[PDB]
């Protein structure tokens, strides 16, 4: 399992800043906290997937809690943005993007952790492995070298005490809420698979095979050629793995074939393999 939180803090004005933080569990976006300096009242904490309704019915004050935590984080975030904009300025956008991740085994035990910050798309500082030593920018390829001594000074000045609490959250509550979230996420959901051939061109054609609504996201889509003749330029190719609102995924693939051959599409998702005819004769 993996419980990940993404924070995007945008600085537009000294009075215009936005923070949108999203929680993602096993690839499913389930939580969002949003707030703008302009309003702040209208700050919100929403479940963003159907199973979060079950979470709320079982923990009635979950959303109010998270929102209070969010309101606080934004306060600190407002200071951090103003401070980086002043000290670093920006090249493309004055945005601070940071994230923390929790890796656990099925049964909930902590396997790995990570906390990372990036400003204007540039890595600023990270915390990995033992989660005790922060690293900094990759000054060899980053415009951030323009402010190296300032950044190194900020990184060197991070206590072992502000750090440990980040580590204990990752090893503590983070792995603990992962177990809870685990009890509510949907069960393995296999794809609806569809395939066929199209765009006939002389003795050539295009075979396709697409998988719809599967979760988890890992999947294997293969064309099985029951024959010997294949075009020279032929090479199977899949579009990227894409998300849909309901927390499931989508993936389509294609291959150049001789309209001649027998092809089927094999799709393996978890411990399940489906096979359908795609072109016959």
């Amino acid at each position: 399992h993996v419980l990940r939180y993404g924070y995007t803090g945008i600085f537009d004005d000294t009075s215009h800043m936005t923070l949108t933080v999203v929680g993602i569990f096993d690839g499913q976006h389930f939580f969002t906290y949003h707030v703008q300096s302009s309003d702040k009242a209208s700050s919100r904490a929403n479940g963003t997937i159907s199973w979060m309704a079950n979470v709320s019915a079982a923990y009635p004050t979950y959303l109010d809690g998270e929102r209070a935590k969010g309101d606080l984080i934004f306060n600190q975030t407002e200071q951090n943005l103003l401070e980086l904009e002043i000290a670093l300025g920006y090249r493309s956008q004055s945005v601070l993007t940071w994230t923390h991740e929790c890796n656990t085994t099925e049964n909930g035990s902590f396997v790995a952790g990570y906390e990372g910050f990036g400003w204007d798309g540039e890595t600023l500082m990270e915390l990995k492995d033992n989660l005790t030593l922060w690293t900094g920018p990759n000054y060899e390829i980053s415009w951030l070298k323009q402010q190296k001594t300032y950044i190194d000074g900020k990184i060197k000045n991070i206590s072992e005490g502000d750090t440990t609490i980040q580590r204990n959250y990752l090893k503590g509550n983070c792995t603990q809420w992962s177990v809870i979230y685990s009890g509510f996420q949907p069960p393995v959901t296999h794809p609806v698979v569809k395939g066929g051939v199209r765009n006939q061109n002389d003795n050539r054609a295009e075979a396709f095979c697409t998988s719809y609504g599967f979760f988890p996201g890992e999947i294997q889509i293969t064309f099985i050629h029951y024959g010997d003749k294949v075009p020279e330029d032929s090479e199977p190719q899949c579009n990227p793995l894409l998300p849909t609102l309901d927390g499931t995924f989508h993936q389509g693939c294609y291959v150049a074939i001789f309209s001649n051959q027998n092809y089927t599409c094999r799709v393996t998702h978890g411990n399940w393999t489906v096979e359908i005819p795609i072109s016959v004769t």
Binding site: V21, E66, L72, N80, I158, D162, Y169
Partner: peptide
Amino acid sequence: ALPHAILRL
């Protein structure tokens, strides 16, 4: 759930 603490930059 979100952590209670943010790093001070």
